[PDB]
DNA sequence: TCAATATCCACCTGCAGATTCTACCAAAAGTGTATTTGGAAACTGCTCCATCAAAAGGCATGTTCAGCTGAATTCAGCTGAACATGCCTTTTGATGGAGCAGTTTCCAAATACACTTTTGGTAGAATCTGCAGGTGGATATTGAT
DNA sequence: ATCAATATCCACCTGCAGATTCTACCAAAAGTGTATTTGGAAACTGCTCCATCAAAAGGCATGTTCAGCTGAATTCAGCTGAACATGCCTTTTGATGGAGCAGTTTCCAAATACACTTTTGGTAGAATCTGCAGGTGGATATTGA
């Protein structure tokens, strides 16, 4: 019956922020209902903007692009910056 | 050779192989490619780290040291961006953000 | 005997609702209205009491909303009292209706 | 069990006085009581009607919180905090 | 290539009205309507297969789909075509 | 010998199971599906029509313009309710004023 | 000399333009700004005509709605004369403000 | 540009939309609200443009941008 | 009502831009086999949902009473409609040229796969503690004089 | 401008309901060695997408008049807010019984995989055609008198 959730990575980005501070559970799974909801956007986005150009294989391309049409620059700009970043730093294995 | 994370290869909290599974379970496309998971991973880590930022901070003003719904909303409302992301999103618990109209008040 | 002025307490009760987040329906009466209009849907079914907490938080977001709406096609009208009319219009406007 | 009836008047006027009041609502017309639960009874229809459809898709006779947040999302009103 | 529904779109139109013809734009707006409908359904039977954790689009979640999607008498009637024609069709 | 004629419809009951595969909505595309959603489309299709064909008919006109597709979908509640966010391009609007607005 | 009586002449019209479905804004001015825009995001941009086209339909027919629901915004407040008040009005309520 | 957007063309369009008086000011009013409706139009379009790497905005990247914001249009495409 | 503008409104009429109609080749669509396997059916372990009981007080009901708000009227300043002029910018109709979507043709970099070890997480026990709720003076905030 | 009357604050407290940690697996990432593709990269077209040219034709920009619409100013019936007295019925706690989710297994009917074999659907000319766009000539619809 075990179950995956992304509170365990809320969690350690929320030390992050903000060493000195909780969060109650409801707060917690709304956090989840949020992580869930967007990469359910960004995921269609990216499949569908695969599909316009034909292609059968979703690359960081489609997500950066997805993106890009999701979020409200700055959040946008910010965005792609980060997954650039981990991405090159990725590839640089 | 010892066992590297991907996440931290990609300098992430947020878990790459999971991400990486839940878009090839998820019928977005017959196959995906290795940075995809990485770039979402991160965007999601940026925007969870945003918002989080701000709800703790909405909860510092508030005096408490637990963040709860009503400090998301908070965090999300004031914010306009994040409040235009999620302007179709109820936040249970979340209430709203104090605000009379003007021809209200004494006159 | 003191007596507030009418638009005082009302002015009063909105800064406190506003700064608060509990429901403002009262349970009970909510989960009934919820099992009879289920019930008059489809029979013998049943709810998790989160299945109703759920509508509960929606129906009230929702509500809360409307008649933020509502209020400001009243006061567009040069007025500060809500009418039907008000909620009609705000509803035409949102597209629940044309 | 029992019979369930006019529980729509289960919705006082105090409560809906309640929800004026946080959104932010100073005066209300007398009227303003029965087109609240008029408007009230078809969102929650509505919201059930597709619940229930889920529901049965499912082949149970428990409606569980998914089915509503599914069902919320249909009418593009995603609710955050029952997820699980 | 660019295969469109334009003809079964037109076979249709004679059956209801032999007498009537259609524009070009009328045509391709027959044919966005046909593509976003399909979409809809589809979509929406995708996810319905994911809740219950099925691997597989069965004309079950074609049906529940269109419940959820065609709204009132739309819906029952789509309903009833739709049944029918897994019946005369599975008769061989 | 096509699954369509089979099925007795005039909708691609073939293309419509191969676009169900290459869509990406599913693993596994049950038999029936693509004859089911095929049927529904042509029968909203033969519905739009059908009021499309009568809009068409009472302007005078033997073929079917947009302004027809716009007038058959507006003037019907239940398809204005599914093609609510959708606009007919060059199907202008349905003729229709506000009492107020008329004279005396 | 003969002369029609204010709003005699506006009534003509609605019934004229709610009985047509030509476009109302005029094709040259519409693509100038089109590219204008566009610019700004992307430079050196061609454009299929149907693009274009595509581009006046949705916008004008955008327009026509809010003018549709700014309208009543207008009857709303006891009035016969659309205002800014009521644009705004309407896209508030619209979400999209 | 935004000024070729000519007075006359928006009593046209109010027209279509049943509107009897126009206040003086509505014509300002509606040059900025077309401009933000294009901006947003058009910037989603773009981005569809760039991603199949072309130099040219199609019909259907405006199509996709119109669904994107939830104003589908029929007969281009979809 | 009388009369004089302009507006609409059928009935016919003649081509031109599209439609509908034809004549043909591939790429889906139907097939005959040979495999995979998904998930309906069959249990049954056990959370959770529907119920019941009882007591307590937070709150919904009803009724009084009169402040001040919405609805009616009036009245006139001036904004926005109707128009005749005068004129500029949109149409539109080929020509020609050229940027460039759309197609092919490769294939090396990049993925999907099939197994095999190794952890990273999730499900509860075991521990910790913000903060919910109560109290009480300190401070306004209102509203009558 | 005073102040009573009341409501709003804010710091001070203390158990315990709701977080946090501590532990243990075990389902699924990471590690490697093959069996396929894919997505790009060049190369070339044939499209259609600019650019001009260049008249005519509306359709837009002004300036005039003044009709009638929107406000501003006044009133007043009575609607709807503030308070109070009553006592109902939603809350809160606890405890069950068993309906019916959920977790596992079992395994055929059903869907996927080739390898082919036809047939149908998209193309680009060929053979008609539905309405547009005029043209009157005839009742309307407006509006001044
Ligand atoms: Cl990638
Ligand atoms: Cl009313
Ligand atoms: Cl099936
Ligand atoms: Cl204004
Ligand atoms: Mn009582
Ligand atoms: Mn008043
Ligand atoms: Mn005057
Ligand atoms: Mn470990
Ligand atoms: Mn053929």
């Not at chain 1, 965005?79 to 590839?91: I, P």
């Not at chain 4, 005066?27 to 078809?42: A, F």
Request: glycine share 6%.
């Amino acid at each position: 019956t075990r179950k995956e959730s992304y509170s365990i990575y809320i969690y350690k980005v929320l030390k992050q922020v903000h060493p000195d501070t909780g969060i109650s559970s409801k707060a917690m799974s709304i956090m989840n209902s949020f992580v869930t909801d967007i990469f359910e956007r960004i995921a269609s986005e990216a499949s569908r903007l695969a599909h316009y150009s034909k292609r059968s294989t979703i690359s960081s391309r489609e997500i950066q692009t997805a993106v890009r049409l999701l979020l409200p620059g700055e959040l946008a700009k910010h965005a792609v910056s980060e997954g650039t970043k981990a991405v090159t730093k990725y590839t640089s294995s | 050779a010892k066992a590297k994370t991907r996440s931290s290869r990609a300098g992430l909290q947020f878990p790459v192989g999971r991400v990486h599974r839940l878009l090839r379970k998820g019928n977005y496309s017959e196959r995906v490619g290795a940075g995809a998971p990485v770039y979402l991973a991160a965007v999601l880590e940026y925007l969870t780290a945003e918002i989080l930022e701000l709800a703790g901070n909405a909860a510092r003003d508030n005096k408490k040291t637990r963040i709860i719904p009503r400090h998301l909303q908070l965090a999300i409302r004031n914010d306009e961006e994040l409040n235009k992301l999620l302007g179709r999103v109820t936040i249970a618990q979340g209430g709203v953000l104090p605000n009379i109209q003007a021809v209200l008040l004494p006159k | 005997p003191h007596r507030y002025r009418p638009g005082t307490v009302a002015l009063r009760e909105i800064r406190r609702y506003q700064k608060s987040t509990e429901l403002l329906i009262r349970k009970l009466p909510f989960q009934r209205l919820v099992r009879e209009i289920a019930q008059d849907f489809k029979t013998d079914l049943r709810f998790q009491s989160s299945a109703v907490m759920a509508l509960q938080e929606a129906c009230e977001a929702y509500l809360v909303g409307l008649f933020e709406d509502t209020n400001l096609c009243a006061i567009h009208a040069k007025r500060v009292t809500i009418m039907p009319k008000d909620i009609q219009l705000a509803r035409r406007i949102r597209g629940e209706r044309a | 069990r029992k019979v369930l009836r006019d529980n729509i008047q289960g919705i006082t006027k105090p409560a809906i006085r309640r929800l004026a009041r946080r959104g932010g609502v100073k005066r209300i017309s007398g009227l303003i009581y029965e087109e609240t639960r008029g408007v009230l009874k078809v969102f929650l229809e509505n919201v059930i009607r597709d619940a229930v459809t889920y529901t049965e898709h499912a082949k149970r006779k428990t409606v569980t919180a998914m089915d509503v947040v599914y069902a919320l999302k249909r009418q593009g009103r995603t609710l955050y905090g029952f997820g699980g």
